[PDB]
Subunit: 429 residues, 2 copies
């Protein structure tokens, strides 16, 4: 009553790592527990494809790429991931009349460039990609069910609106679970599931007349169709928490008439530039492509590894923030050059392989580093401290390789572990 | 009257529910680390006087696979030691026949052993311990056993392990793994810790006179020095279970005066050829180098993956056993070829990405395969059935790639998972 409740999944029969994640449904770090076995069903909101993507977009998709690699490569969860493409939107329609190429052709062009930018940043494609334009029929059926459950109504003009008041009345439903204080139509807060088509706009048939999906209904529809009635993880940037994500929860609860569609809602922090969110509207943005003419994938990923994913970060342009990233990337490149040369030039015939006190001290540091990094990853994917641990280990390996007689097997094993963590970070050396 | 075994406590340990065939219990028992997720592992190494053969490959490749499963798949932290017996009666005899120094012979065949391991994609251990570099430590180890009253000195300057005295202690049992395999000596079963050397043999100083280590003492000494008083895993071929490994247990228990030096003792089965152990003494052997002039590393590793590590296996020469290995290797090569090209040439601009029933069916089989393979690895490293599970999945992916419009992201994830399992098997495509 008056405050939304959250049900932690039961631990019996689940993979239990003791990972804690910052859950927006609880506004707290809570233990992450799969709904089933070691499986993670994960939906992440995708871009609206009418122009080039920028560094703020990169921060969200790279940060969740890192989290996905930690979940899969490091913890060995089984991740089934869906990302949508909003290729029907007011912005796409308006941009297409300006550009005088079909709306489909414009949306497809900027979707293609989005995925090329993701590939350039070594971001893994999701399991499924759901374009609104390929799901309109399913969206209509989804809305039909919400109406049948009495949680939406049809206006005279042919639009369909979600009935917030009817939804709240139900004891099993709470509206705006994540931002309770942020809250033709019955009430102003009602939001469109189906918009009657304006003249000259692209449109689709429905029982209520020609129209387009509303802003939020595609994500509930697509995630529900592929992933079902319980998502382990839903993600997006913090600006989407309300109204978009809270409205997705209400739509999906209305469709299934249950109380918890998402177990863990994860929200990345914004990249700021000169104190403000990097934003197309503010014209303060740097495109991913322009960033990539000056900096590499590794350097950009290090920029993001240095900042906790769920906190905001400041980007100082003109290379100021990238100085440290370039230095770190260079130290990793040089570390690999040196250790590979030491391994290559090692001669078993002329060496002595006695396990010395220096060998033992490096090994002790090595195993300790593994446990420190494990605790950092369990602590809500703390990559800044994990990256620091790798840097400290590399500093000691460099000292060891310069003076001590080297244990070839130990150096190889350390290199393989650092390779393993770098694969988890998405770095390529 | 029968040896007891203490299962490690589960509190605070990484618990995977892995079961392993433990020679100390003659049964499959749950594997539990002594500390956290750490595995201290000693494996007996070669005697370096001649070339390694396919039977040696079977043992070192099988335990390489187990190590990759433990590390890459389950994420245990393995600290592994392998010794090199570069002082031995066989080395001395061979070196006089060929008229070269004992060290020059041993370094040559140690070098060829590691080259053969690398050719088979076998990972080097953390530490490599040569007897010739540990003689001083062996002397100190023997001094302690004498001080604990479990060894005696003969008039000629040899030191023998005192089986009768060791057994008398209520905390010690002699021959824990093969209880039934049991003039100057007190009892015939007593075995040398230090052998008085003939003036023409290589020898080292000691409190008891010039001599050489006995046959078993080097392994207790080296493992105890580097890994300590409790090993999680000790491994070797089944012929070493007695007397060599049972004697290591007695020596190490006598040194530490405790009851369990090794928690899990793993013994690989022998590779036979025409019904008999592949053996230098029988002159029925195939060198690893000769095998690699006929078959690839992948094909040889598939041969071993097809046979449970702890069971004996028959090798039929003249290509008979390798027919199936070549076919499997060919099917993996052709699968990777197609999936890599389909991923590389996929065009996001022109495709349709609707998640169809065929996509869903392949995804269901994919996740199911992950669970089957997990159960096989937990079942005492059952690679034959995991390999079969991969083959079955590949057959369905090949059908999907031929007919259905392809989900690029699903194919990428399948490719990455199969790569992950092939990394765990040590296959390279
Ligand atoms: N790497 C993995 N692959 C597939 N299933 C897993 C994995 N790790 C844990 N599980 C599942 O997690 C549940 C409990 O994990 P555990 O108690 O660690 O065996 C079982 O249903 C297992 O099948
Ligand atoms: N400046 C930014 N920093 C971090 N994430 C952002 C930024 N701008 C947009 N995003 C996220 O990028 C994703 C796509 O943004 P949009 O295309 O605006 O829907 C959403 O999850 C947004 O929250
Ligand atoms: N991947 C890993 N890396 C380092 N330590 C681990 C790992 N998995 C489990 N552990 C350790 O195992 C003990 C208990 O495991 P758990 O209960 O799974 O956290 C703790 O001391 C953990 O640090
Ligand atoms: N035919 C064989 N099959 C499997 N393992 C063997 C075979 N011959 C020797 N080994 C193992 O290879 C390792 C080194 O053997 P050796 O070089 O004979 O001391 C030991 O663990 C032996 O048990
Ligand atoms: Na309510
Ligand atoms: Na908002
Ligand atoms: Na006894
Ligand atoms: Na034996
Ligand atoms: Zn969305
Ligand atoms: Zn040994």
């Amino acid at each position: 009553g008056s405050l939304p409740k959250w049900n932690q999944p039961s631990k019996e029969g689940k993979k239990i790592t003791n990972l804690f994640v910052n859950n927006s449904l609880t506004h707290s770090k809570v233990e992450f527990i799969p709904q089933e076995g070691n499986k993670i069903k994960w939906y992440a909101c995708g871009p609206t494809v009418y122009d080039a993507a920028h560094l703020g977009h990169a921060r969200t998709y790279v940060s969740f790429d890192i989290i996905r690699r930690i979940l899969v490569n490091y913890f060995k969860y089984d991740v089934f991931m869906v990302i949508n493409i909003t290729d029907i939107d007011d912005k796409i329609i308006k941009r297409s009349v300006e550009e005088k190429i079909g709306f489909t052709e414009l949306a497809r062009k900027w979707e293609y460039e989005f995925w090329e930018d993701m590939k350039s940043l070594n971001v893994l494609l999701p399991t499924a990609i759901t374009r609104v334009s390929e799901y309109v029929g399913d969206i209509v059926k989804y809305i039909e069910k919400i109406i049948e459950n009495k949680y939406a109504y049809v206006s005279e003009e042919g639009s369909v609106y979600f009935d917030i008041d009817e939804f709240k009345k139900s004891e099993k439903h709470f509206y705006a679970r994540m931002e309770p204080l942020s809250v033709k139509k019955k009430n102003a807060y009602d939001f469109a599931l189906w918009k009657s088509s304006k003249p000259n706009e692209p449109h689709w048939d429905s029982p209520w007349g020609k129209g387009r999906p509303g802003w939020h209904i595609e994500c509930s529809t697509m995630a529900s169709n592929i992933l079902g009635d319980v998502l382990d993880i839903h993600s997006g940037g913090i600006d989407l928490r309300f109204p978009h994500h809270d409205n997705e929860l209400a739509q999906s609860e209305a469709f299934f008439d249950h109380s918890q569609w998402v177990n863990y809602f994860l929200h990345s922090g914004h990249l700021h530039i000169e104190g403000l969110k990097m934003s197309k509207s503010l014209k303060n943005f740097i495109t991913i492509k322009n960033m990539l003419t000056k900096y590499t994938s590794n350097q950009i990923r290090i920029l993001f590894l240095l900042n906790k994913w769920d906190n905001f970060m400041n980007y100082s342009p003109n290379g100021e923030s990238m100085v440290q990233c370039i230095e770190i990337d260079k130290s990793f490149t040089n570390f690999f050059a040196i250790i590979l040369m030491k391994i290559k030039n090692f001669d078993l015939n002329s060496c002595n392989l006695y396990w010395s006190d220096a060998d033992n001290k490096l090994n002790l540091l090595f195993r300790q580093t593994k446990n420190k990094i494990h605790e950092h990853f369990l602590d809500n994917f703390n990559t800044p401290d994990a990256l620091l641990a790798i840097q400290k280990l590399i500093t000691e390996i460099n000292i060891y390789m310069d003076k001590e007689k080297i244990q070839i097997g130990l150096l190889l094993e350390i290199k393989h572990y650092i390779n393993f963590i770098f694969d988890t970070f998405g770095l390529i050396y």
